[PDB]
Structure formats: structure tokens, C-alpha cells
Amino acid sequence: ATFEIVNRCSYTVWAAASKGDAALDAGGRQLNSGESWTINVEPGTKGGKIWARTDCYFDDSGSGICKTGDCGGLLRCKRFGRPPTTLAEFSLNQYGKDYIDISNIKGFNVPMDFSPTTRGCRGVRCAADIVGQCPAKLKAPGGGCNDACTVFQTSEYCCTTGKCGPTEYSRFFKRLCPDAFSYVLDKPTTVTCPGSSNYRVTFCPTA
């Protein structure tokens, strides 16, 4: 499977890509404005994610920092990212089907489009101006908009039981971004496409 991570943002970003315990394809890139990087994701791959890192410096040694989605300090993300981050997440070939989906459970820090490039199903999207109306207590350290948990690490906000519920915060994201997860116990927003379908990820969708 191929994912086309297109960067439409007016700035530079370091798209990111991990299956959490490892990179997915090349793990990390940097695209300037209007650039795409094409990664081959392994078939049957479970639980990969793609996100975007903001405001960074990495040497000729793949280290450094990013105000957002910093993955243990390194270009080539082999590990998931530091909050706050719009979460592009897929599981492929789990019995004929594929699972695409965007989640704000890890916050928001860049608008995204995750859409199939094949025939089959729908893409999902979360391009509202989150940073723009982020509640000030979610107001982000880097230039994103943090999630309750990353902000209080309280039970409530963290679903630190299993038994959960919605919060005045979870719905800010949900009022804004309905097709994405605003919390764990969130009525899943998954979009089951066809097996082996190819996708396209877009940073700063039409707008």
C-alpha cells in the first residue's frame, strides 16, 4: 500500500509515520510547501499513524526538535508523536477490509485529509480551525490545541478507568470535527474501505 502525504500547508512540515514500535517506510520526511512524499506501507500493517510535525530543526544526524508532534527528537520517526497532533490512523487488511481514520484524541495542530485514492469508500477530514478556537486551557504549548488528558491527566479526561464520558472539551473537537475521535470512548468514526486500497493524506485540505 501507498500513502501520498501531500503538503498543502503554506509552510514547511515534517510529515510523520509510525506503526509505533517502528517506522512505516521511511518514518519521517520534511516537505516544503506544495510537496508530497510517497511511502509504501506494508500490507496487513496494523496500527500505523501519520501526523505532521511543526517548527523544527534536525541536523545532518536526524535529531533535533519540533514544537509539535515531536517523536522522541528525530526526523525519522520510529515512535509515535508528542502531542498535540491531528491523527491520521490506518490498519490494513484485517480480513478483506482496511480501516482508515483521523483522531483528535491526541489533540490538533494541523488540518488533514485522509482519503482513499482508489474506488471504494470515503475519506475523512478534520480541517476546521481548531487552533483558531481552541479553548485557552487547551491552548497549546507548541502551536496546536491540546486535548483534555494532555492537559490535566485527570481520570475523566483520560478514561483512566475504562468507563468513560464526554467532556466540555471533547465536544469542542466534536462540534468542530465530527468525523474524527474526540476521546477514547468515542463512538468510533472508522471508515472501512476495501482491502489493499491505496490512500492519499493531505495536510491543509481544500481551504
PDB file of C-alpha atoms in Angstrom:
ATOM      1  CA  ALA A   1       0.000   0.000   0.000  1.00  0.00           C
ATOM      2  CA  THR A   2       0.952   3.528  -0.843  1.00  0.00           C
ATOM      3  CA  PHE A   3       0.014   6.714   1.005  1.00  0.00           C
ATOM      4  CA  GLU A   4       0.524  10.033  -0.705  1.00  0.00           C
ATOM      5  CA  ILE A   5       1.132  12.605   2.173  1.00  0.00           C
ATOM      6  CA  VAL A   6       0.680  15.851   0.294  1.00  0.00           C
ATOM      7  CA  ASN A   7       1.670  19.089   1.996  1.00  0.00           C
ATOM      8  CA  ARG A   8      -0.670  21.933   1.092  1.00  0.00           C
ATOM      9  CA  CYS A   9       0.165  23.972   4.219  1.00  0.00           C
ATOM     10  CA  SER A  10       1.806  27.309   3.400  1.00  0.00           C
ATOM     11  CA  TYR A  11       4.738  26.229   5.492  1.00  0.00           C
ATOM     12  CA  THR A  12       7.117  23.502   5.942  1.00  0.00           C
ATOM     13  CA  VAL A  13       6.211  20.439   7.848  1.00  0.00           C
ATOM     14  CA  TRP A  14       7.725  17.085   8.663  1.00  0.00           C
ATOM     15  CA  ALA A  15       5.172  14.616   7.917  1.00  0.00           C
ATOM     16  CA  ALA A  16       5.444  11.716  10.258  1.00  0.00           C
ATOM     17  CA  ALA A  17       4.734   7.914  10.007  1.00  0.00           C
ATOM     18  CA  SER A  18       4.950   5.163  12.501  1.00  0.00           C
ATOM     19  CA  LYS A  19       3.380   1.890  13.413  1.00  0.00           C
ATOM     20  CA  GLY A  20       4.504   2.907  16.844  1.00  0.00           C
ATOM     21  CA  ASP A  21       7.138   0.363  17.505  1.00  0.00           C
ATOM     22  CA  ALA A  22       8.629   1.218  14.250  1.00  0.00           C
ATOM     23  CA  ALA A  23       8.722   3.395  11.252  1.00  0.00           C
ATOM     24  CA  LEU A  24       6.424   2.922   8.359  1.00  0.00           C
ATOM     25  CA  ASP A  25       8.507   3.266   5.288  1.00  0.00           C
ATOM     26  CA  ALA A  26      10.911   5.983   5.875  1.00  0.00           C
ATOM     27  CA  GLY A  27       9.365   7.140   9.214  1.00  0.00           C
ATOM     28  CA  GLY A  28       9.910  10.830   8.695  1.00  0.00           C
ATOM     29  CA  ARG A  29      10.223  13.395   5.988  1.00  0.00           C
ATOM     30  CA  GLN A  30      10.139  17.233   5.508  1.00  0.00           C
ATOM     31  CA  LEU A  31       8.203  18.666   2.782  1.00  0.00           C
ATOM     32  CA  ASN A  32       8.294  22.202   1.812  1.00  0.00           C
ATOM     33  CA  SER A  33       5.103  23.905   0.727  1.00  0.00           C
ATOM     34  CA  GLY A  34       3.248  22.021  -2.055  1.00  0.00           C
ATOM     35  CA  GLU A  35       5.265  18.877  -1.729  1.00  0.00           C
ATOM     36  CA  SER A  36       4.454  15.218  -1.428  1.00  0.00           C
ATOM     37  CA  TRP A  37       6.344  12.249  -0.148  1.00  0.00           C
ATOM     38  CA  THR A  38       5.250   8.741  -1.217  1.00  0.00           C
ATOM     39  CA  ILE A  39       5.534   5.977   1.239  1.00  0.00           C
ATOM     40  CA  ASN A  40       4.886   2.277   0.894  1.00  0.00           C
ATOM     41  CA  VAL A  41       3.088   0.934   3.778  1.00  0.00           C
ATOM     42  CA  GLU A  42       3.268  -2.814   4.416  1.00  0.00           C
ATOM     43  CA  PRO A  43       0.309  -4.867   3.717  1.00  0.00           C
ATOM     44  CA  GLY A  44      -1.572  -6.168   6.689  1.00  0.00           C
ATOM     45  CA  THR A  45       0.236  -3.428   8.697  1.00  0.00           C
ATOM     46  CA  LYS A  46      -1.572  -2.768  11.791  1.00  0.00           C
ATOM     47  CA  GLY A  47      -1.937   0.462  13.607  1.00  0.00           C
ATOM     48  CA  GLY A  48       0.122   2.869  11.613  1.00  0.00           C
ATOM     49  CA  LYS A  49      -0.302   6.568  12.018  1.00  0.00           C
ATOM     50  CA  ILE A  50       0.664   9.734  10.100  1.00  0.00           C
ATOM     51  CA  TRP A  51       0.851  13.151  11.542  1.00  0.00           C
ATOM     52  CA  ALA A  52       2.658  16.382  10.958  1.00  0.00           C
ATOM     53  CA  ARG A  53       5.408  17.940  12.922  1.00  0.00           C
ATOM     54  CA  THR A  54       5.595  21.720  13.299  1.00  0.00           C
ATOM     55  CA  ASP A  55       8.502  24.151  13.703  1.00  0.00           C
ATOM     56  CA  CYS A  56      11.712  22.016  13.767  1.00  0.00           C
ATOM     57  CA  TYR A  57      15.453  21.675  13.325  1.00  0.00           C
ATOM     58  CA  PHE A  58      17.123  18.391  12.857  1.00  0.00           C
ATOM     59  CA  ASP A  59      20.854  18.292  11.909  1.00  0.00           C
ATOM     60  CA  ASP A  60      22.704  16.050   9.469  1.00  0.00           C
ATOM     61  CA  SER A  61      22.064  13.475  12.108  1.00  0.00           C
ATOM     62  CA  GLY A  62      18.305  13.253  12.116  1.00  0.00           C
ATOM     63  CA  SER A  63      17.987  14.615  15.619  1.00  0.00           C
ATOM     64  CA  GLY A  64      16.627  17.940  16.921  1.00  0.00           C
ATOM     65  CA  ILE A  65      13.230  19.278  17.945  1.00  0.00           C
ATOM     66  CA  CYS A  66       9.629  20.095  16.846  1.00  0.00           C
ATOM     67  CA  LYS A  67       7.168  22.294  18.700  1.00  0.00           C
ATOM     68  CA  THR A  68       4.561  19.697  17.791  1.00  0.00           C
ATOM     69  CA  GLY A  69       4.365  16.026  17.234  1.00  0.00           C
ATOM     70  CA  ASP A  70       7.981  15.590  18.302  1.00  0.00           C
ATOM     71  CA  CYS A  71       8.747  11.812  18.049  1.00  0.00           C
ATOM     72  CA  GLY A  72      11.499  11.243  20.573  1.00  0.00           C
ATOM     73  CA  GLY A  73      13.502  14.047  18.847  1.00  0.00           C
ATOM     74  CA  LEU A  74      14.141  12.696  15.303  1.00  0.00           C
ATOM     75  CA  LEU A  75      13.239  13.259  11.669  1.00  0.00           C
ATOM     76  CA  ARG A  76      12.809   9.573  11.015  1.00  0.00           C
ATOM     77  CA  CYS A  77      10.015   8.752  13.463  1.00  0.00           C
ATOM     78  CA  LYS A  78      10.170   5.159  14.614  1.00  0.00           C
ATOM     79  CA  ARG A  79       7.977   6.081  17.506  1.00  0.00           C
ATOM     80  CA  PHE A  80       4.588   7.836  17.874  1.00  0.00           C
ATOM     81  CA  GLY A  81       4.494  11.649  18.289  1.00  0.00           C
ATOM     82  CA  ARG A  82       4.426  14.101  21.104  1.00  0.00           C
ATOM     83  CA  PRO A  83       1.112  15.906  21.485  1.00  0.00           C
ATOM     84  CA  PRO A  84      -0.673  17.999  20.208  1.00  0.00           C
ATOM     85  CA  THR A  85      -1.361  16.207  16.905  1.00  0.00           C
ATOM     86  CA  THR A  86      -4.159  15.574  14.334  1.00  0.00           C
ATOM     87  CA  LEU A  87      -4.146  11.823  13.983  1.00  0.00           C
ATOM     88  CA  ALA A  88      -4.139  10.089  10.732  1.00  0.00           C
ATOM     89  CA  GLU A  89      -4.545   6.419  11.512  1.00  0.00           C
ATOM     90  CA  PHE A  90      -4.961   3.176   9.457  1.00  0.00           C
ATOM     91  CA  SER A  91      -4.947  -0.648   9.894  1.00  0.00           C
ATOM     92  CA  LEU A  92      -4.750  -2.552   6.740  1.00  0.00           C
ATOM     93  CA  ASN A  93      -6.091  -5.926   5.543  1.00  0.00           C
ATOM     94  CA  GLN A  94      -7.820  -7.054   8.641  1.00  0.00           C
ATOM     95  CA  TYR A  95      -9.824  -9.757   6.854  1.00  0.00           C
ATOM     96  CA  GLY A  96     -10.537  -8.270   3.399  1.00  0.00           C
ATOM     97  CA  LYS A  97     -11.201  -4.861   4.905  1.00  0.00           C
ATOM     98  CA  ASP A  98      -8.945  -1.735   5.723  1.00  0.00           C
ATOM     99  CA  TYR A  99      -9.556   0.839   8.446  1.00  0.00           C
ATOM    100  CA  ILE A 100      -8.859   4.459   7.838  1.00  0.00           C
ATOM    101  CA  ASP A 101      -9.476   7.225  10.281  1.00  0.00           C
ATOM    102  CA  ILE A 102      -8.496  10.652  11.773  1.00  0.00           C
ATOM    103  CA  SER A 103      -8.355  11.288  15.559  1.00  0.00           C
ATOM    104  CA  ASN A 104      -8.083  14.381  17.668  1.00  0.00           C
ATOM    105  CA  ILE A 105      -7.687  12.241  20.892  1.00  0.00           C
ATOM    106  CA  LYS A 106      -4.141  13.349  20.663  1.00  0.00           C
ATOM    107  CA  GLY A 107      -5.055  16.938  20.126  1.00  0.00           C
ATOM    108  CA  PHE A 108      -4.830  19.091  16.972  1.00  0.00           C
ATOM    109  CA  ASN A 109      -2.116  21.033  15.396  1.00  0.00           C
ATOM    110  CA  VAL A 110      -2.676  20.873  11.598  1.00  0.00           C
ATOM    111  CA  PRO A 111      -5.661  20.363   9.270  1.00  0.00           C
ATOM    112  CA  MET A 112      -5.769  16.954   7.432  1.00  0.00           C
ATOM    113  CA  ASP A 113      -7.370  14.852   4.690  1.00  0.00           C
ATOM    114  CA  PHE A 114      -7.132  11.117   4.720  1.00  0.00           C
ATOM    115  CA  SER A 115      -8.743   9.773   1.695  1.00  0.00           C
ATOM    116  CA  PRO A 116      -8.740   6.664  -0.324  1.00  0.00           C
ATOM    117  CA  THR A 117      -7.303   7.116  -3.814  1.00  0.00           C
ATOM    118  CA  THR A 118      -8.995   4.020  -5.072  1.00  0.00           C
ATOM    119  CA  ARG A 119     -12.661   3.162  -5.728  1.00  0.00           C
ATOM    120  CA  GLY A 120     -14.408   2.085  -2.683  1.00  0.00           C
ATOM    121  CA  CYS A 121     -15.152   4.387   0.197  1.00  0.00           C
ATOM    122  CA  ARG A 122     -14.905   7.839   1.735  1.00  0.00           C
ATOM    123  CA  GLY A 123     -12.112   9.864   3.011  1.00  0.00           C
ATOM    124  CA  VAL A 124     -12.393  11.611   6.301  1.00  0.00           C
ATOM    125  CA  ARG A 125     -11.420  15.052   7.225  1.00  0.00           C
ATOM    126  CA  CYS A 126     -10.641  17.467  10.013  1.00  0.00           C
ATOM    127  CA  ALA A 127      -9.937  20.882   8.633  1.00  0.00           C
ATOM    128  CA  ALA A 128     -11.829  23.187  10.955  1.00  0.00           C
ATOM    129  CA  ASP A 129      -9.742  25.981  12.585  1.00  0.00           C
ATOM    130  CA  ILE A 130      -9.101  24.134  15.918  1.00  0.00           C
ATOM    131  CA  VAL A 131      -6.061  26.276  16.854  1.00  0.00           C
ATOM    132  CA  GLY A 132      -8.254  29.113  15.858  1.00  0.00           C
ATOM    133  CA  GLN A 133     -10.895  28.341  18.542  1.00  0.00           C
ATOM    134  CA  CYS A 134      -9.073  26.243  20.860  1.00  0.00           C
ATOM    135  CA  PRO A 135     -10.172  26.671  24.414  1.00  0.00           C
ATOM    136  CA  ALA A 136      -7.405  28.703  26.118  1.00  0.00           C
ATOM    137  CA  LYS A 137      -6.792  25.925  28.601  1.00  0.00           C
ATOM    138  CA  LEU A 138      -6.191  23.635  25.727  1.00  0.00           C
ATOM    139  CA  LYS A 139      -4.197  26.493  24.265  1.00  0.00           C
ATOM    140  CA  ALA A 140      -1.118  24.859  23.130  1.00  0.00           C
ATOM    141  CA  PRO A 141       2.401  24.964  24.173  1.00  0.00           C
ATOM    142  CA  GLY A 142       3.798  24.495  20.585  1.00  0.00           C
ATOM    143  CA  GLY A 143       1.118  25.955  18.304  1.00  0.00           C
ATOM    144  CA  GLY A 144      -1.577  23.366  18.361  1.00  0.00           C
ATOM    145  CA  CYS A 145      -4.510  22.784  20.643  1.00  0.00           C
ATOM    146  CA  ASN A 146      -4.089  20.254  23.378  1.00  0.00           C
ATOM    147  CA  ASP A 147      -6.580  17.534  24.427  1.00  0.00           C
ATOM    148  CA  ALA A 148      -8.037  17.325  27.970  1.00  0.00           C
ATOM    149  CA  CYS A 149      -5.734  14.420  29.011  1.00  0.00           C
ATOM    150  CA  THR A 150      -2.511  16.070  27.768  1.00  0.00           C
ATOM    151  CA  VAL A 151      -3.799  18.896  29.913  1.00  0.00           C
ATOM    152  CA  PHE A 152      -4.936  17.515  33.159  1.00  0.00           C
ATOM    153  CA  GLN A 153      -4.093  13.860  33.069  1.00  0.00           C
ATOM    154  CA  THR A 154      -7.149  13.553  35.256  1.00  0.00           C
ATOM    155  CA  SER A 155      -9.297  10.397  35.232  1.00  0.00           C
ATOM    156  CA  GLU A 156     -12.200  11.985  33.487  1.00  0.00           C
ATOM    157  CA  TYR A 157     -10.265  13.382  30.673  1.00  0.00           C
ATOM    158  CA  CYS A 158      -8.161  10.292  30.448  1.00  0.00           C
ATOM    159  CA  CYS A 159     -10.693   7.497  30.556  1.00  0.00           C
ATOM    160  CA  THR A 160      -8.209   6.218  33.116  1.00  0.00           C
ATOM    161  CA  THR A 161     -10.748   3.572  34.130  1.00  0.00           C
ATOM    162  CA  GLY A 162     -12.296   2.321  31.029  1.00  0.00           C
ATOM    163  CA  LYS A 163     -15.503   3.722  31.942  1.00  0.00           C
ATOM    164  CA  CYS A 164     -15.749   6.956  30.149  1.00  0.00           C
ATOM    165  CA  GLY A 165     -17.867  10.023  29.306  1.00  0.00           C
ATOM    166  CA  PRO A 166     -17.850  13.214  27.234  1.00  0.00           C
ATOM    167  CA  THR A 167     -16.472  16.488  28.453  1.00  0.00           C
ATOM    168  CA  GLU A 168     -16.991  20.005  27.664  1.00  0.00           C
ATOM    169  CA  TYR A 169     -13.597  19.800  25.915  1.00  0.00           C
ATOM    170  CA  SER A 170     -14.131  16.563  23.928  1.00  0.00           C
ATOM    171  CA  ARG A 171     -17.027  18.162  22.205  1.00  0.00           C
ATOM    172  CA  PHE A 172     -15.181  21.261  21.200  1.00  0.00           C
ATOM    173  CA  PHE A 173     -13.362  18.995  18.829  1.00  0.00           C
ATOM    174  CA  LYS A 174     -16.597  17.147  18.098  1.00  0.00           C
ATOM    175  CA  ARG A 175     -18.587  20.339  17.388  1.00  0.00           C
ATOM    176  CA  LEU A 176     -15.756  21.184  15.125  1.00  0.00           C
ATOM    177  CA  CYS A 177     -14.588  17.883  13.868  1.00  0.00           C
ATOM    178  CA  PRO A 178     -17.326  15.323  13.739  1.00  0.00           C
ATOM    179  CA  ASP A 179     -15.659  12.712  11.570  1.00  0.00           C
ATOM    180  CA  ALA A 180     -12.764  12.300  13.956  1.00  0.00           C
ATOM    181  CA  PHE A 181     -12.243  10.864  17.512  1.00  0.00           C
ATOM    182  CA  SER A 182     -12.646  13.430  20.268  1.00  0.00           C
ATOM    183  CA  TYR A 183     -11.987  10.886  23.010  1.00  0.00           C
ATOM    184  CA  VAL A 184     -11.424   7.151  23.535  1.00  0.00           C
ATOM    185  CA  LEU A 185     -14.919   6.019  24.363  1.00  0.00           C
ATOM    186  CA  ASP A 186     -15.978   7.954  21.376  1.00  0.00           C
ATOM    187  CA  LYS A 187     -18.436   6.372  19.036  1.00  0.00           C
ATOM    188  CA  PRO A 188     -15.849   5.128  16.590  1.00  0.00           C
ATOM    189  CA  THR A 189     -15.521   7.041  13.392  1.00  0.00           C
ATOM    190  CA  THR A 190     -13.767   4.466  11.390  1.00  0.00           C
ATOM    191  CA  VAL A 191     -14.278   4.174   7.601  1.00  0.00           C
ATOM    192  CA  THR A 192     -13.900   0.641   6.343  1.00  0.00           C
ATOM    193  CA  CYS A 193     -12.603   0.671   2.877  1.00  0.00           C
ATOM    194  CA  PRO A 194     -11.672  -2.273   0.650  1.00  0.00           C
ATOM    195  CA  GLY A 195      -8.695  -4.458   1.198  1.00  0.00           C
ATOM    196  CA  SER A 196      -5.412  -3.206  -0.352  1.00  0.00           C
ATOM    197  CA  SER A 197      -6.865   0.067  -1.301  1.00  0.00           C
ATOM    198  CA  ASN A 198      -4.308   2.994  -1.741  1.00  0.00           C
ATOM    199  CA  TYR A 199      -4.658   6.265   0.145  1.00  0.00           C
ATOM    200  CA  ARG A 200      -3.954   9.878  -0.012  1.00  0.00           C
ATOM    201  CA  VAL A 201      -3.099  12.060   3.091  1.00  0.00           C
ATOM    202  CA  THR A 202      -3.389  15.690   2.918  1.00  0.00           C
ATOM    203  CA  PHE A 203      -2.058  18.418   5.137  1.00  0.00           C
ATOM    204  CA  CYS A 204      -4.193  21.617   4.875  1.00  0.00           C
ATOM    205  CA  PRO A 205      -7.047  20.288   2.686  1.00  0.00           C
ATOM    206  CA  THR A 206      -9.104  22.492   0.468  1.00  0.00           C
ATOM    207  CA  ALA A 207      -9.317  25.803   2.170  1.00  0.00           C
TER     208      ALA A 207
END
